[PDB]
Structure formats: C-alpha cells, structure tokens
Amino acid sequence: DELSFDMSLVLLTGDTYATTEELTIQNCHVAVFDKDGKRIYFKNFYSKDLGEMKTIGNLSGYELQLEGVRTFGKEDKKVSVLVVANANNANNSPFDNLTTYDGVDNSYTAKTIAKGPVTASLLVKIGKSETTLKYNQDNAPVTVSLIQLSAKIEYTGVYKKENGELLEGFSLTKVAGLNASSKITIFNTSAVENGAFSDLAYPTTKPVTFYTYEISDAFKEVILSVQSGVEPKEYPFPANKFIKGNYYRIKGLKSSTEIEWVLENVEDKEVTLD
C-alpha cells in the first residue's frame, strides 16, 4: 500500500536593491521531510528545469514541480520542504547522502558548505516551508521564501566630511577576513547564526562590491586596505555586523585628520559609526 503526490513549488527570491544576477537561481536541491525529520523525497533541479524567472511588479520567483513524492496512504500527511539554491555539483548535490534534517550523523543541520560567494549569478539561497499533502484531493501551490545566505558589501569611497564631496584616490587594495564556509539551516536575516568559517580570498580584480558568509566570532574582523598615500592603511570592521540576506555600504569621511567610517544597512535604512 503506497500513494504518489506531485507538488507545485514557488521559490521567491525577492519581495529593488538586488540585481537580476543576485536573484538568479541556476540550480537547486529540494528536500521533503516527514514530522519526525526523515527525508522522504529529494530532487536536484538545473537551469532547464527551473524555467524562466517570473516577475509581477515588485515580486519575483521560479515555479517547480515535485513529481512522485511517495507516502503510504493515511489521509492528510503534514510535511516540510527545504530548498538549497546554487550549491549543486554538475549532476548531483553535496546534500544527496543527508537522510535526516536534524541528526548526529549525515544531517542538513550538521552540513557545512565551503564554496564561497564570488559570482553574483551563483549566490547560495536557502528556505523552508511547512505544508500538508491532501490525499485523493486536488493539489495547491506551496511557496518557499528564500534568503540570501551571504551578505552583500559595497565600498563607496572616502568623502569630505564638510560638504559630502567624493575624493579621488582612496582605492580599495585588499579585503581580509571574508568567509567561504557556512551552515545551510540558518534563516534569521536579523541575527548572525553561522558558526562555520574558512578564508575567502579577495579577488585579484579588486571589486568594489563583494560578498561573504556570516561570521559569528565576536573577535574576527573584515579588514579593508585603502590607499592613504605611499602605503595603504588597514581599517578593521566587526565581522559579525554583516548578516546574511543584507546589503551594506562602507563610506569614509575625511576631515584633514583621520577617517570616520560609516556602515550602512541599505534595506533597513540605518547607519553605524564610532
């Protein structure tokens, strides 16, 4: 005795600061679990399966079909669906051998990915939703709201404190302390939860907009090396201020003395300085 369901899945990347690249999903891993956290179904989707990015004004996302989710037929069955976007390998995902959501061995909560945020169009997103599979009844769509597992950081230069005029020079030469490792079951876009850490090199193209996974250690720093004449000076920021699913701007204020740095949380419209 066994019944088979097909689920309609909606992946929402955004609900106007994120670029089309940063909203792109090229591949994903979808996992379905029972009430006890046992994985009953999983599927790895790629660009031909994900289809096109649908957009209705302010909203944007992808539609997916989960064919052949097997149950054992006892009316309604409450389940949860977890989506990990842009972390798959060529033909499979690193999560394929994870048989439980929360467990001691081979679990999604224990899983750490070490592939750092570098490409805007291949940024990892994660989401989880709870639903009920209605037996011998017509299907209904289930939406999964995905968050950005990385933080977005834009260095916008050094300005004159007196008039707000942008100064020439003050080139970003180095960013040290960016994180390339992360947990995949953390969804709070307001608190730092990632305990995983490994060094993420600052690209040789020295970009002004760059990414990192969260850093929980209160003693870790993200250090910016900006030109101040002959030798570039180091400027440290608390690594735990950059939370996943947020966009930040680093601005400096020159006053013929030192530089007064400003950390802005763009979506929240908040600023933090000394």
UniProtKB/Swiss-Prot annotation:
Its main location: other. GO terms for cellular component: pilus. It is found in: Fimbrium. Pfam families: Fim1F_C, P_gingi_FimA. Keywords: Fimbrium, Signal. It comes from the Bacteria. The keyword Cell membrane does not apply. The keyword Transmembrane does not apply. Belongs to the bacteroidetes fimbrillin superfamily. FimA/Mfa1 family. Putative component of the fimbrium tip. Fimbriae are filamentous appendages on the cell surface that mediate cell adhesion and biofilm formation. May be part of the fimbrial tip. This is Putative fimbrium tip subunit Fim1F. It comes from Parabacteroides distasonis (strain ATCC 8503 / DSM 20701 / CIP 104284 / JCM 5825 / NCTC 11152). The lineage of its organism: Bacteria, Pseudomonadati, Bacteroidota, Bacteroidia, Bacteroidales.
